[PDB]
Amino acid sequence: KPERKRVSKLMAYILRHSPEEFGLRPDVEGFVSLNELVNALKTVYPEVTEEFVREIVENDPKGRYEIRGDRIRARYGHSFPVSLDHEEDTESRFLYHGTPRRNLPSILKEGLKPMKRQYVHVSTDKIEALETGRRHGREVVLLVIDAECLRKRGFKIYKAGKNVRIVERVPPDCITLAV
């Protein structure tokens, strides 16, 4: 059961960041072949099979991965451009983003920016926002974002996981509170 986390984490690396380092070239929507990914994962964990990966996909709590037939992709978090077809979140009134406090003086000046990824990632869920923010450092703040502000400015919000949402950027006057 903790072997699943090891393989799931390498999957995120390959599917979000450096497919080229395993000699994979994802298509425009971000998909690679399921056979490609197993063969790529095998040169680190040779025990890995297509069923193990399909178990990982179906089980994932956030919906990190997507399988269409024989192809697989990460649904968000990429650091190379992709063409995702997610649905627009038109109902959320508030969204959340956790980040180390040390980041706040720049965010207040520039808003949230995608940094190394393609999109800014926010959450419909306060706990998941705080938990991801905690990965970078121990002192985390919870940013509350007015979603309607973003829509009015043209930045549409898309449902990329269970609670994960993606936007181009969050201008600072759409951040209503930092907690």
Ligand SMILES: NC(=O)c1ccc[n+]([C@@H]2O[C@H](COP(=O)([O-])OP(=O)(O)OC[C@H]3O[C@@H](n4cnc5c(N)ncnc54)[C@H](O)[C@@H]3O)[C@@H](O)[C@H]2O)c1
């Ligand atoms: N941060 C969250 O609340 C959150 C919510 C949902 C999902 N996730 C997921 O967690 C993982 C990491 O996401 P992440 O949001 O930590 O991003 P990341 O790993 O790309 O780290 C970027 C960091 O830069 C900070 N930052 C943003 N704008 C900045 C600015 N103008 N000046 C200085 N710093 C700035 C961000 O808050 C974040 O801490 C990804 O898988 C993402 O999808 C994160």
